[PDB]
């Protein structure tokens, strides 16, 4: 607008620097998401393993309890 | 020591190597190529001929030669026995996914609910499948089981383990099947016949042919392992010869040719392959009956001949 | 013209800023889901141990 | 009456309501509806409900056995363990490492993993209100309780290393309310006199903030609460007015930043500051059976409008 005194080449440089900062930031976030997705799935699988084992123990108890009541 | 080697395979995402022997079984981590780090051993059951892990969890299923019709499922960190099931014949394969546990006999397949290990469905009177050839998807939206639908022809039955009904039959080859593998998405099935000249990839479940990869014209081999990279872009095929072919699933002018190749230091050994990214570099892993794990580097852009970079004893020995 | 380059650059920045905010929200949501799963795992483990003991008693009394 | 207890979980994502008939959990992920996500009628006259964040582990106490703590897995409908105390249970607080039980003259610090008693603070000054606070943070895992029944001294106890970390002479008037921020490094305090709300660093005990609580009326402050980011602090009382303070060092220091006018005064209430659907809210659970929901503008403050109002008993009136 009227009275602007910033040289266009300076503005370009500010922008391209900002672009790179965001690009870097976006790639670190995508990485962080990938790593956490993998960790979460590992935890989900272990939770399921524990639950399966819990169900089996639940049924063992139910048997001992019901055959002797 | 470990005694005779009986079994070796990779888990569903190639993060663990399982080794069964006379002495018991072991798990090794596959997060490094510089050493093969043992993360578990159990000697409570000898002569372990089948080990199947649920990914990297503590759930494991085991079969021993001392009772080859009996499957034992356990939480290996706690020792708690989950279940023990005995079948009418020798167990030939045991496969697991996050919803299902499948057991392959020569003439029947058992589909168990993994949540409670109850049998949901039995596929009875299959064409005899003495090699235990089957494949089970690890994808919950594409939760299919593939197995041979004919003893004379390379027809693939594709069974939906959620609907508990056949999803499709794929006439994949004109002679009996030799090998089968799903990719991680559950939407690609790789196949080979006993002739072994072409490796085909089909869309799952709809059944159209997506790729045909050629390794020979008149020279036949016995393909024994097909493996996808986790992203579905690469497909390896190994056999009773010294060459492993690696194919890239890309639409290309010269369709059918191998993208990369590997030369094994042996011929004529049982072997199993997988494609795994380790320490930022795609690898071809080969476990073989000579007692070794081989690790070759794959350049996913340039292909070509892959160097043998690391080799490790399957029994955990330093050399 | 250099002023179009600016307008391109500023267009791109706005796009990346939107993508970046989308990713931060995805990560915050997953961090929360993961924390909840960890807490549920711990609740299950404490309950598993209690069942273990309860099994140990009922077989011993039986 | 019908309702006996209501509180928020550690990060204001779940509302717990105890009643003669049992207890319930409600989701706080939306302002338009109060979704019931669980109800149990196995235990009647539930007077204390304490959930472990958004997990299935819950500690409950019933008026029918007021000295007995039941720790349960509510999705399985299963009692995990229980513990009986020598006197009525006045408060239960928990985080991911510790469960504390407050009696009138003793406090018990349990390992949450196995509920073994790690330490007992004996012969405390009588605390019939069960006034205490427990940090929700693992690295700064402090318990705060009154160090005197006639002076507003705060005892600050390290529940991991099991040692008194400090005594904060917060007020001369006896303590009326206590709250840790989510980091466990700040503690808000208020006395029965109710003239100033103070914020202290933890464990160092330096006074970081002092807020003046409005007109010099006789007030009994009952609830202090921090936003999850520690920037805002609410204080409510038996009065119609809730004050919200902003912990910024570059403003008109000491003055309230926003206010709420309740439609129901004269009884105790519980407040919390929660961002719901990307908007910061003040939540007020009141003795008239209602949850009230106000919008906070984090930049301009001022008076906060009542947006939504929900029945604590779950009736969709």
PDB file of C-alpha atoms in Angstrom, chain B residues 6-122:
ATOM      1  CA  UNK B   6      13.606 -76.739  13.506  1.00  0.00           C
ATOM      2  CA  UNK B   7      11.836 -73.486  12.724  1.00  0.00           C
ATOM      3  CA  UNK B   8      12.467 -69.848  11.914  1.00  0.00           C
ATOM      4  CA  UNK B   9      10.156 -67.053  10.820  1.00  0.00           C
ATOM      5  CA  UNK B  10       9.456 -63.341  11.060  1.00  0.00           C
ATOM      6  CA  UNK B  11       6.510 -61.841  12.863  1.00  0.00           C
ATOM      7  CA  UNK B  12       3.808 -59.906  11.040  1.00  0.00           C
ATOM      8  CA  UNK B  13       5.682 -56.597  10.735  1.00  0.00           C
ATOM      9  CA  UNK B  14       9.253 -57.990  10.602  1.00  0.00           C
ATOM     10  CA  UNK B  15      10.216 -56.600  14.011  1.00  0.00           C
ATOM     11  CA  UNK B  16      10.924 -60.004  15.590  1.00  0.00           C
ATOM     12  CA  UNK B  17      12.615 -63.223  14.461  1.00  0.00           C
ATOM     13  CA  UNK B  18      11.383 -66.461  16.077  1.00  0.00           C
ATOM     14  CA  UNK B  19      13.641 -69.547  16.190  1.00  0.00           C
ATOM     15  CA  UNK B  20      12.501 -72.988  17.337  1.00  0.00           C
ATOM     16  CA  UNK B  21      15.006 -75.729  18.108  1.00  0.00           C
ATOM     17  CA  UNK B  22      15.440 -78.919  20.116  1.00  0.00           C
ATOM     18  CA  UNK B  23      16.114 -76.826  23.228  1.00  0.00           C
ATOM     19  CA  UNK B  24      13.093 -74.519  23.002  1.00  0.00           C
ATOM     20  CA  UNK B  25      12.439 -71.229  21.252  1.00  0.00           C
ATOM     21  CA  UNK B  26      13.897 -67.746  21.120  1.00  0.00           C
ATOM     22  CA  UNK B  27      12.850 -64.311  19.928  1.00  0.00           C
ATOM     23  CA  UNK B  28      15.355 -61.856  18.482  1.00  0.00           C
ATOM     24  CA  UNK B  29      14.861 -58.169  17.828  1.00  0.00           C
ATOM     25  CA  UNK B  30      15.295 -56.909  14.271  1.00  0.00           C
ATOM     26  CA  UNK B  31      15.824 -53.249  15.075  1.00  0.00           C
ATOM     27  CA  UNK B  32      19.577 -53.467  14.370  1.00  0.00           C
ATOM     28  CA  UNK B  33      21.624 -55.112  11.627  1.00  0.00           C
ATOM     29  CA  UNK B  34      24.862 -55.003  13.599  1.00  0.00           C
ATOM     30  CA  UNK B  35      23.803 -57.693  16.061  1.00  0.00           C
ATOM     31  CA  UNK B  36      20.915 -60.093  16.487  1.00  0.00           C
ATOM     32  CA  UNK B  37      19.755 -59.226  19.991  1.00  0.00           C
ATOM     33  CA  UNK B  38      17.978 -61.980  21.909  1.00  0.00           C
ATOM     34  CA  UNK B  39      14.919 -60.651  23.747  1.00  0.00           C
ATOM     35  CA  UNK B  40      13.398 -63.906  25.033  1.00  0.00           C
ATOM     36  CA  UNK B  41      14.110 -67.602  25.388  1.00  0.00           C
ATOM     37  CA  UNK B  42      11.931 -70.418  26.723  1.00  0.00           C
ATOM     38  CA  UNK B  43      13.241 -73.951  27.261  1.00  0.00           C
ATOM     39  CA  UNK B  44      10.083 -75.239  28.975  1.00  0.00           C
ATOM     40  CA  UNK B  45       9.003 -77.079  25.808  1.00  0.00           C
ATOM     41  CA  UNK B  46      11.546 -78.962  23.724  1.00  0.00           C
ATOM     42  CA  UNK B  47      11.502 -79.640  19.980  1.00  0.00           C
ATOM     43  CA  UNK B  48       9.589 -76.451  19.106  1.00  0.00           C
ATOM     44  CA  UNK B  49       8.572 -76.794  15.449  1.00  0.00           C
ATOM     45  CA  UNK B  50       6.129 -73.865  15.229  1.00  0.00           C
ATOM     46  CA  UNK B  51       6.292 -70.439  16.896  1.00  0.00           C
ATOM     47  CA  UNK B  52       3.762 -67.738  16.029  1.00  0.00           C
ATOM     48  CA  UNK B  53       3.798 -64.392  17.854  1.00  0.00           C
ATOM     49  CA  UNK B  54       1.067 -61.770  17.918  1.00  0.00           C
ATOM     50  CA  UNK B  55       3.195 -58.919  16.491  1.00  0.00           C
ATOM     51  CA  UNK B  56       5.523 -57.755  19.320  1.00  0.00           C
ATOM     52  CA  UNK B  57       3.127 -58.573  22.147  1.00  0.00           C
ATOM     53  CA  UNK B  58       3.542 -61.229  24.780  1.00  0.00           C
ATOM     54  CA  UNK B  59       1.000 -63.610  23.163  1.00  0.00           C
ATOM     55  CA  UNK B  60       2.648 -66.636  21.543  1.00  0.00           C
ATOM     56  CA  UNK B  61       1.461 -69.916  20.066  1.00  0.00           C
ATOM     57  CA  UNK B  62       3.744 -72.965  20.115  1.00  0.00           C
ATOM     58  CA  UNK B  63       3.758 -76.514  18.742  1.00  0.00           C
ATOM     59  CA  UNK B  64       6.225 -79.226  19.754  1.00  0.00           C
ATOM     60  CA  UNK B  65       7.268 -82.309  17.828  1.00  0.00           C
ATOM     61  CA  UNK B  66       6.588 -84.220  21.044  1.00  0.00           C
ATOM     62  CA  UNK B  67       2.861 -83.504  20.500  1.00  0.00           C
ATOM     63  CA  UNK B  68       2.538 -82.328  16.910  1.00  0.00           C
ATOM     64  CA  UNK B  69      -1.285 -82.122  17.008  1.00  0.00           C
ATOM     65  CA  UNK B  70      -1.350 -79.830  20.063  1.00  0.00           C
ATOM     66  CA  UNK B  71      -1.305 -76.040  20.073  1.00  0.00           C
ATOM     67  CA  UNK B  72      -0.322 -74.211  23.175  1.00  0.00           C
ATOM     68  CA  UNK B  73      -1.026 -70.511  23.479  1.00  0.00           C
ATOM     69  CA  UNK B  74       0.600 -68.449  26.239  1.00  0.00           C
ATOM     70  CA  UNK B  75       1.497 -65.007  27.590  1.00  0.00           C
ATOM     71  CA  UNK B  76       5.221 -65.512  27.625  1.00  0.00           C
ATOM     72  CA  UNK B  77       6.128 -62.685  29.979  1.00  0.00           C
ATOM     73  CA  UNK B  78       3.761 -63.943  32.696  1.00  0.00           C
ATOM     74  CA  UNK B  79       3.854 -67.658  31.796  1.00  0.00           C
ATOM     75  CA  UNK B  80       0.049 -67.848  32.004  1.00  0.00           C
ATOM     76  CA  UNK B  81      -1.322 -70.599  29.773  1.00  0.00           C
ATOM     77  CA  UNK B  82      -4.161 -69.210  27.700  1.00  0.00           C
ATOM     78  CA  UNK B  83      -5.307 -72.364  25.976  1.00  0.00           C
ATOM     79  CA  UNK B  84      -4.295 -75.786  24.684  1.00  0.00           C
ATOM     80  CA  UNK B  85      -6.188 -77.293  21.732  1.00  0.00           C
ATOM     81  CA  UNK B  86      -5.579 -80.688  20.117  1.00  0.00           C
ATOM     82  CA  UNK B  87      -6.481 -81.360  16.482  1.00  0.00           C
ATOM     83  CA  UNK B  88      -7.196 -84.527  14.540  1.00  0.00           C
ATOM     84  CA  UNK B  89      -3.925 -84.383  12.567  1.00  0.00           C
ATOM     85  CA  UNK B  90      -0.501 -82.770  12.532  1.00  0.00           C
ATOM     86  CA  UNK B  91      -0.533 -78.971  12.739  1.00  0.00           C
ATOM     87  CA  UNK B  92       1.088 -77.618   9.582  1.00  0.00           C
ATOM     88  CA  UNK B  93       0.711 -73.869  10.094  1.00  0.00           C
ATOM     89  CA  UNK B  94      -0.477 -71.465  12.750  1.00  0.00           C
ATOM     90  CA  UNK B  95      -1.277 -67.874  11.784  1.00  0.00           C
ATOM     91  CA  UNK B  96      -2.371 -64.938  13.858  1.00  0.00           C
ATOM     92  CA  UNK B  97      -3.821 -61.532  13.317  1.00  0.00           C
ATOM     93  CA  UNK B  98      -5.502 -59.065  15.695  1.00  0.00           C
ATOM     94  CA  UNK B  99      -8.875 -60.790  15.356  1.00  0.00           C
ATOM     95  CA  UNK B 100      -8.178 -64.429  14.495  1.00  0.00           C
ATOM     96  CA  UNK B 101      -5.972 -67.447  15.066  1.00  0.00           C
ATOM     97  CA  UNK B 102      -5.895 -69.927  12.191  1.00  0.00           C
ATOM     98  CA  UNK B 103      -4.707 -73.510  12.259  1.00  0.00           C
ATOM     99  CA  UNK B 104      -3.930 -75.360   9.034  1.00  0.00           C
ATOM    100  CA  UNK B 105      -4.134 -79.162   8.815  1.00  0.00           C
ATOM    101  CA  UNK B 106      -3.623 -81.160   5.621  1.00  0.00           C
ATOM    102  CA  UNK B 107      -7.389 -81.388   4.956  1.00  0.00           C
ATOM    103  CA  UNK B 108      -8.996 -78.787   7.220  1.00  0.00           C
ATOM    104  CA  UNK B 109      -8.545 -75.228   8.468  1.00  0.00           C
ATOM    105  CA  UNK B 110      -9.707 -73.930  11.850  1.00  0.00           C
ATOM    106  CA  UNK B 111     -10.649 -70.286  12.321  1.00  0.00           C
ATOM    107  CA  UNK B 112     -10.551 -69.264  15.989  1.00  0.00           C
ATOM    108  CA  UNK B 113     -11.680 -66.039  17.609  1.00  0.00           C
ATOM    109  CA  UNK B 114      -8.486 -64.664  19.106  1.00  0.00           C
ATOM    110  CA  UNK B 115     -10.439 -62.977  21.917  1.00  0.00           C
ATOM    111  CA  UNK B 116     -11.518 -66.257  23.555  1.00  0.00           C
ATOM    112  CA  UNK B 117      -9.798 -68.870  21.299  1.00  0.00           C
ATOM    113  CA  UNK B 118     -13.165 -70.435  20.436  1.00  0.00           C
ATOM    114  CA  UNK B 119     -13.537 -72.058  17.022  1.00  0.00           C
ATOM    115  CA  UNK B 120     -15.790 -69.852  14.880  1.00  0.00           C
ATOM    116  CA  UNK B 121     -15.689 -71.944  11.698  1.00  0.00           C
ATOM    117  CA  UNK B 122     -14.001 -75.030  10.284  1.00  0.00           C
TER     118      UNK B 122
END
